[PDB]
């Protein structure tokens, strides 16, 4: 029950539950590569979740055998955006895989994320991302974290990939150990480009507070607070 | 007694300690404008220390009024480079100014640095490299940690400054609040450039762990570790 797609036109379907793993068929791409799959619930429990970025059958890490995704028209995705359309923060206790074609993931939920022991798997670049993207005619601008005072939380089971991180949130509150080849984390309350170049900030009302405890097992750490006389405490 | 220049070619003069504050006649800069100054000891005191940089008499801030530096020869520095020779730590517990014209300041010392309440006035970058620098036929090529092990330490009482912030050694150890513009801490064996590129990188016998406690109040922060195995504690 962990995820539920939206019914609408971005809405993915679930093919098959494999051992409490859940396995979406993400919506076609569209002509940027990116496919936008809406959700009025976005959660991974323990047994994790693949989402099939697959043009041939083969075997997934997660949940076996999986089948070629219909869905992509024989184009599989670049970037997979998962996109949060509810007033439901997503909670993450498991491995994310893509199955198929590596892509770029992104959950976006500007209401809130957490993750305690979650994870991703054949992903290049992996971004969570406390906030909306901007989309005009279609087409994918960047993220928006304005006005938003939510908390992104990586609980004591820490979080891991081999690929590059991304953590886009008006505040971060880490307890665990991040391991990634690159970590990338980015607090206040900002407007992103696409490849979270920052292009805007602005002063919260009051103070939004990060708190980094635990390990993080990278060759590349870089944390950028823009909201002024905030802080990163450590 | 903190600070005892070397009584070599690069050894710097001191000219005045006022209220305990030791005042240092940088020598001469080289064409590349580097004023290389070479010490037996560096430390500095609650009082501070100030590097005369000027070349007209002037109030300075932590030793009162002071004169031009006639060591300049009418071209102030664009680097201070400070450079232990010895086998003596270095002890910072104060500010350090630089009087007169705005620079670059970088402290070498390859045997460890520890900051408890240390700061930079007037200084458009400051760093401090647990590593010596290195030099071809009289020039500046950058700095090296390699086959060093030593630590760079900031105490409960941080360190402040209104500038850049270079922190590069084998491995940091931090306890306070580290206030600046932007924070850049390499660590790990590495070889660096004039302006801290990481030109190589070498895998330590033994871990080379380094620990992040405190605030972290600057509005940009990387850290890199290329100790492969070792690890950003938070």
């Given at each position: 029950?962990?995820?539920?797609p939206?019914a609408?036109?971005?809405?993915?379907?679930?093919?098959?539950?494999?051992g409490?793993?859940?396995?979406?068929?993400?919506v076609?791409p569209?002509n940027e590569?990116?496919?936008?799959?809406?959700?009025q619930?976005?959660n991974?429990?323990?047994?994790?979740?693949?989402?099939?970025?697959?043009?041939e059958?083969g075997?997934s890490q997660?949940?076996?055998?999986?089948?070629?995704?219909?869905?992509?028209?024989?184009?599989?995705?670049?970037?997979?955006?998962?996109?949060?359309?509810?007033?439901?923060?997503?909670?993450?206790?498991?491995q994310?895989?893509?199955?198929?074609?590596?892509?770029?993931?992104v959950?976006?939920?500007p209401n809130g994320?957490?993750?305690?022991?979650?994870?991703?798997?054949?992903?290049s670049?992996?971004?969570?991302?406390?906030?909306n993207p901007?989309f005009?005619?279609?087409?994918?601008?960047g993220?928006?974290?304005?006005?938003?005072?939510?908390?992104?939380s990586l609980?004591?089971?820490g979080?891991?990939?081999?690929?590059?991180?991304?953590?886009?949130?008006?505040?971060?509150?880490?307890?665990?150990?991040?391991?990634?080849?690159?970590?990338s984390?980015?607090?206040?309350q900002?407007?992103?480009?696409?490849?979270?170049?920052?292009?805007s900030?602005?002063?919260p009302?009051?103070?939004?507070?990060?708190?980094?405890?635990?390990?993080?097992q990278?060759?590349?750490i870089?944390?950028?607070?823009?909201?002024?006389?905030?802080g990163?405490?450590?």
């Open positions: 029950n962990g995820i539920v939206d609408g036109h971005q809405g993915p379907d679930v093919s098959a539950v494999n409490g793993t859940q396995v979406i068929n993400i076609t569209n590569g990116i496919s936008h799959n809406q959700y619930d976005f991974v429990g323990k047994p994790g979740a693949v989402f099939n970025n697959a043009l059958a075997q997660l949940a076996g055998h999986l089948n070629a995704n219909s869905n992509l028209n024989g184009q599989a995705a670049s970037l997979i955006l998962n996109e949060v359309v509810s007033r439901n923060p997503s909670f993450l206790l498991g994310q895989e893509v199955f198929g074609i590596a892509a770029e993931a959950l976006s939920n994320i957490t993750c305690d022991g979650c994870g991703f798997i054949n992903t670049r992996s971004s969570l991302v406390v906030g901007l005009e005619n279609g087409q994918l601008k993220y928006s974290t304005l006005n938003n005072t939510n908390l992104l609980g004591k089971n979080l891991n990939t081999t690929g590059l991180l991304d953590l886009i949130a008006p505040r971060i509150d880490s307890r665990g150990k991040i391991t990634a080849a690159e970590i984390a980015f607090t206040g900002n407007t992103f480009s696409q490849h979270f170049d920052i292009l900030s602005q002063k009302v009051s103070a939004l507070d990060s708190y980094f405890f635990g390990s993080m990278s060759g590349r870089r944390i950028i607070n823009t909201a002024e006389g905030s990163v405490k450590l």
